[PDB]
Every structure is written in C-alpha cells, then in structure tokens.
Design a protein around this nucleic acid. Structure first.
Ligand SMILES: Nc1ncnc2c1ncn2[C@@H]1O[C@H](CSCC[C@H](N)C(=O)O)[C@@H](O)[C@H]1O
Ligand SMILES: [Zn+2]
Ligand SMILES: [Zn+2]
Ligand SMILES: [Zn+2]
Ligand SMILES: [Zn+2]
Lengths: 472, 7
DNA sequence: GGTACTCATCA
DNA sequence: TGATGAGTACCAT
C-alpha cells in the first residue's frame, strides 16, 4: 500500500523476471526482465515525473540501469538523460517541452566534472559508446540537451544518480539516487577532444539529506567456532558492560535431533553425475515440478519463493557444487552481529547480498513442540520446532521486522517429511552493506496468553514506517 | 518465528 | 512507418 | 576489451 512497499514489490517482481531470463539463458536478461515488466504493465511509475518519486528516497541504491527502468525512475537502459518529450506538452502547458527529469552520471563522458554538491554534466551526443569512449563529433542543442536547457530556464529540478564501481563478489556496479539538482546554467564550448560539447552546471537543492561520502566495540572476534567459512565478529557499541552474545550459547553448524524426535526415512535422490543440469533426467527437478528452483548465478540464487524447495541430498549422485544444493553451501557473506538499541542482538552484512541468495539455515536443537523461549522456530510448511535457545548457528540473532529484507523458505533435501523441513533464510531483496537483516516472524496479534485470559504482549521496534507496533 | 510460504 | 540515437552489460 | 541491445522520439529519403 505505502509507497516504499510498492517500490519494494516492483523490484521483487523485476528480480523474479530477471532470474527467469537468466535461467532461460537469454541475452541481456536484465533488459529482457524489463521487457517482461512492460508487457505485464508492471512499471510502477509508467509516466514521467518531475521531482521525487514516492517510495524512492534520496540515497536509494539501484543494482542496475534496468532496475531503474523497471520502477519508472529512469526509462532508458542506456541514455544518460531521461526527459518528457513533446507528448507531455499539453499536460505541462505552462512549461516549454522537452523537459529533463532524471540524469545518470557514470563517468563515461570525458568532459563530466563531479564535485558532489556541484556537477558539470556534459550533454548527450557525439560520444563513442565503445572504444576510447571519447567525443567524435559536435553536440547539438536538441533532445536531452534541449530538455536540460528548458529545466534551467524554468527552474525545474532534475534527479541525479551516480554510478559507482563495487569491489564485491557479486555486484560490479551500483547506482545511487543522490537527490534533486537545479540546472544553474549551461553553455557550449570545445571539449577536451576539440568538438563542441554542451555543459550543464548543476547545484544540489537544499532541504535534502546530506550527500554522504564513501575494530570498534568488538566483543568477540568470531561468534562461530571458526566454524563458519567466514568469521562473524560481534560488537557492542551500545553498552560498556560488553558481554558477548556467545555466553550461555554454543555455536553449531548442524542440527541436533532430540531423542524423542523421529528421523524420517532418507530420500532416494537423483542419479546425475557432477552437477544437475537437465530437468528431464534429474528426479530432484521432477520433485520441484519439472524445473530447477535455483539459477546458477552468483553461486546460486533462488528464483522465487515456494511452498517447498527440493534440494539434492545425501544419496544424489551429484557433487557439492550442484546448483540444486544452493542452501547447503558455505556462508557466502561477511556478516556482523551487533548490539541494537533495544532489540538486543542484531545481524548485518558488510557486503552486497543479491536477491535470491541464501543467507542461512535456521540451526538449533530440533525438539517436539509439546516438550517445550525467544529462540524457537516452529516448522510449518506444528509437531516440531528448532530450539536455538542454548545452541545453534547465527540465524537466531536475526531480528523481526514488519518490512523484512529476508524470507523463510522450507527446504527438503535429506528426507521428504515436511514436518521436519529445513528452514532457510533467503534474501528477498538486494541488500546493501550495513543494512540489518530481518524477516517477519509472523506472530498473530494477541497470540500469547498467561492466561487469566490476560493477553501477554510484546512491543515491536523494527522502526518500519508501517510497524503495527506489536510482535504479538 | 513460525510463519512463511509462497506456493 | 522508419531509424538514428544511446553515461550498459557480458562473454 | 567488442557487439549487441531495445524503446523511444521525432521525422517522415
Ligand atoms: N523488532 C523487534 N522489536 C523489539 N524486540 C525485538 C524485535 N525483534 C526481535 N526482538 C527481540 O529479540 C527476540 C527474538 S531473538 C532475536 C535476537 C535478539 N535480538 C537477541 O538479543 O538475542 C525477541 O524475543 C525480542 O525480545
Ligand atoms: Zn544435484
Ligand atoms: Zn540430479
Ligand atoms: Zn538430486
Ligand atoms: Zn514493527
């Protein structure tokens, strides 16, 4: 309903289409995804907008030019300048069209000069897309150049987005929306290559969050035993009085099954060699409905949520590299546990997490529900639960949010008993560094009773704009 | 932390 | 109807 | 590091 959630949803839909196109092995699956969105009339803002788009805050990180197209934020996958054409003339009759609404600075034009609050942005045209990427003929005062000129003449602000190189395992580039700028002035001159360029001097508008530039409180060098492939440091910056989250808790990477919990019969598995690629041969694919739920991208990404995912298991002929073993693989990301202000322990990531990437299985002691605090995950896809009260992996440190960036996916691999499914946290969204990882616990309101009939309640502090204010 | 699920 | 244009993306 | 890539924007050899 609320604009941020509408944006979130639109971006999830685009991610789904993208990964489907990657799986279908199409060229430029990023662009194909957008084409799918256009076909489905699923572009969130299908008409041009001057100023801010609801739900896209200053600082918003886009993970591709295509994502910007999918939301309607910037409608060309290539062009630096997006503008209202003469089609908008009647709607904006007090302005002269064309009018620019959004530009992208990606450091591709040799005459661009970036000074943060102040920018000198080269017009479009006469630019080599490839090779040396230099100017190769004169520019003209038309199209985007004319559009920016009209912006200057009418005091119409332009959204400005910067490309940034990333040294990340999976994300090469990111685009940050940096707020509105005015076109202060513009002129023509010879560029550094000797051809005419138009130059647009832009000044960031007041009233916006400051442009941002880009070991402390350490309590534990690694909450895992050295067990996780990547260490998980813990910090308390909130309290002197710095006990570590591991106290009273022992880290395990594997489920422990209680005596009174029954171990289901093992699944038969598939007969593929090496890796499972063909949905015809592979029985595990057949279990998934005739298709692989994971795509082989960035070490494996879930295409979309399901009632249950059927992974290759102990008896499958495939080795550990199989893409249908995606959630079984080692921790892919550098994470941190940190003391929050009033949720206690929290987890965040130090690197980018692509949507569909596994974050972790919820590991603990599998107990019968009848035989049983805060760290119990009921398995429902309820007879059984995972008790991470005293022992488990890092999953138990992940907080609830009413607007989560993770989701829970039931996975079967070693057996076919949905009662005892593996519980795996996957990224629902593309996640940026230092963003807290959260999922929706989904306790129904007024769930726990004392009971004198008295409703025992817990206040929620996810800070989300649509918080419903209660865990239960 | 129970609920989930997306056929 | 036709097509020049285009601050990506990836092997 | 080349070769595509696709949706328009405006023209209408
Ligand atoms: N959104 C939220 N607001 C307030 N407390 C929260 C919360 N999400 C989780 N918690 C707290 O964390 C517990 C879930 S276990 C999550 C880890 C916890 N922060 C810890 O320190 O170990 C809940 O019982 C609740 O007390
Ligand atoms: Zn396999
Ligand atoms: Zn197989
Ligand atoms: Zn298998
Ligand atoms: Zn909340």
């Amino acid at each position: 309903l609320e604009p941020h959630l509408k944006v979130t949803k639109c971006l999830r839909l685009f991610n789904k289409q993208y990964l489907l196109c990657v799986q279908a092995k199409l060229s430029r699956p990023d662009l194909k995804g957008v084409t799918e969105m256009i076909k489905a009339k699923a572009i969130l803002y299908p008409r041009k907008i001057i100023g801010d788009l609801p739900g896209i805050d200053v600082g918003h990180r886009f993970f591709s030019r295509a994502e910007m197209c999918a939301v309607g934020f910037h409608n060309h996958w290539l062009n630096g300048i997006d503008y209202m054409s003469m089609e908008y003339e009647k709607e904006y009759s007090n302005y002269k069209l064309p009018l620019a609404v959004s530009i992208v600075m990606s450091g591709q034009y040799e005459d661009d000069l970036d000074n943060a609050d102040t920018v000198t942005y080269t017009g479009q045209g006469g630019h080599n897309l490839t090779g040396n990427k230099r100017q190769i003929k004169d520019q003209l005062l038309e199209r985007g150049n004319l559009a920016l000129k009209h912006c200057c003449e009418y005091n119409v602000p332009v959204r400005v987005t910067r490309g940034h190189n990333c040294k990340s395992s999976y994300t090469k580039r990111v685009y940050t929306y940096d707020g509105l700028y005015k076109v202060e002035k513009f002129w023509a001159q010879k560029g550094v290559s000797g051809f005419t360029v138009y130059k647009y001097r832009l000044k960031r508008l007041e009233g916006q969050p400051e442009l941002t530039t880009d070991i402390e409180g350490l309590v534990c060098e690694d909450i895992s035993g050295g067990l996780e492939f990547k260490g998980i440091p813990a910090t308390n910056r909130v309290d002197d009085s710095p006990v570590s989250p591991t106290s009273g808790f022992t880290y395990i990477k594997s489920l422990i099954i209680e005596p009174n919990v029954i171990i289901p019969k093992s699944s038969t598995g598939c007969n593929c060699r090496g890796s499972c690629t063909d949905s015809k041969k592979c029985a595990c694919a057949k279990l998934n409905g005739g298709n692989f739920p994971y795509v082989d991208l960035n070490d494996g990404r879930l295409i979309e949520s399901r009632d249950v995912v059927f992974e290759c298991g102990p008896h499958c002929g495939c080795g550990p590299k199989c893409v249908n073993r995606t959630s079984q693989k080692r921790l892919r990301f550098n994470l941190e546990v940190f003391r929050s202000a009033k949720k206690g322990w929290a987890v965040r990531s130090w690197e980018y997490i692509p949507a569909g990437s596994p974050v972790c299985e919820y590991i603990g002691v599998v107990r019968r529900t009848a035989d049983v605090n805060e760290y119990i995950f009921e398995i429902d896809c309820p007879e059984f639960c995972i008790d991470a009260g005293s022992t488990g992996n890092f999953a138990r440190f992940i907080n609830h949010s009413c607007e989560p960036n993770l989701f829970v996916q039931c996975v079967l691999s070693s057996h076919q008993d949905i009662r005892l499914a593996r519980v795996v946290l996957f990224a629902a969204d593309n996640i940026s560094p230092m963003q807290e990882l959260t999922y929706d616990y989904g306790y129904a309101l007024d769930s726990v009773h004392g009971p004198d009939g008295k409703v025992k309640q817990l206040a929620c502090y996810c800070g989300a704009l649509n918080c419903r204010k209660r865990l239960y | 932390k129970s609920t989930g699920g997306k056929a």
